[PDB]
């Protein structure tokens, strides 16, 4: 869920970007 | 713990800012500091003249500094040397090299800050507080003034227990926006402690 660093939603919640939430 | 400042409440309508100028985000804090130093130097000098207010305006490297005083004869000095020295201190503080003006206050008893300063003085001279208040309210009311109120804070009469003395008459509608109520505040530094003095004066409506 929103607490998983390795998930899209995890990134969105944590407000960061990365391998699991690209910047395109 | 209630009753917001009436001036601050009315700043949009029937009240206007003491400092009116525009500045950027990299500018504002500095010019504000300057204004503050100006008012701080002016109030600790011109007190004996009874300044009820200090207006400050700016465009570019120029500052209005319109000083409202009950007794302009004090700020003028002899032949105008006082205002010279004051402009000198002004230019020495801020290098902006700016102007100065003096506006007389007709009927100083119709301007709250002066009334409060009066009552404060009387209190510092060990007057009878209750009568000082009632008197002040009377003097304010007798000249124009559709309403008036004066409030003195605790340790009245040097008493061990703080108290609050009231004395208001006329109309003082603090909740009405169009009221146009002058407000003023003066301290009193005594041997036993400090007294707050508030002054409300209601003149006209729309």
């Amino acid at each position: 869920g929103k607490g998983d660093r390795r998930t899209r939603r995890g990134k969105i919640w944590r407000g960061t970007y990365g391998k699991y939430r690209p910047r395109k | 713990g209630n009753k917001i400042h009436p001036i601050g409440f009315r700043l949009g309508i029937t009240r206007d800012w003491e400092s009116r100028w525009y500045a950027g985000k990299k500018q504002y804090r500095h010019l504000l500091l300057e204004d503050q130093r100006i008012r701080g130097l002016l109030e600790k000098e011109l007190y004996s003249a009874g300044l009820a207010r200090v207006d400050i305006e700016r465009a570019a490297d120029n500052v209005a500094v319109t000083v409202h005083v009950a007794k302009p004869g004090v700020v003028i000095g002899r032949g105008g040397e006082r205002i010279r020295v004051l402009r000198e201190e002004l230019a020495k503080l801020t290098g902006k090299n700016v102007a100065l003006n003096v506006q007389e206050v007709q009927n100083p008893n119709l301007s709250a800050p002066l009334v409060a300063q009066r009552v404060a003085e009387q209190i510092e001279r060990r007057f009878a507080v209750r009568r000082a208040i009632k008197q002040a309210v009377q003097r304010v009311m007798e000249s124009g003034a559709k309403g008036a109120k004066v409030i003195v804070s605790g340790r009245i009469g040097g008493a061990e227990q703080a108290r609050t003395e009231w004395a208001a008459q006329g109309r003082v509608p603090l909740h009405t926006l169009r009221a146009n109520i002058d407000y003023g505040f003066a301290l009193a530094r005594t041997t036993y402690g400090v007294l707050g003095v508030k002054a409300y004066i209601f003149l006209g409506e729309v």
Partner: protein
Amino acid sequence: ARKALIEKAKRTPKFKVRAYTRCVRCGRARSVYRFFGLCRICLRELAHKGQLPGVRKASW
């Protein structure tokens, strides 16, 4: 606002990070708005006196 702590203003903080803002008026450390250079209390007081140009009470 202890008087020695007003040593805050330093051309030589010895480090950029040791530099911290204070209230230019009362000397408050915490709650200092960068825009006004003031703290929050002074901010409200002066705002109420009308000494901050353009600053008005907000309602919506």
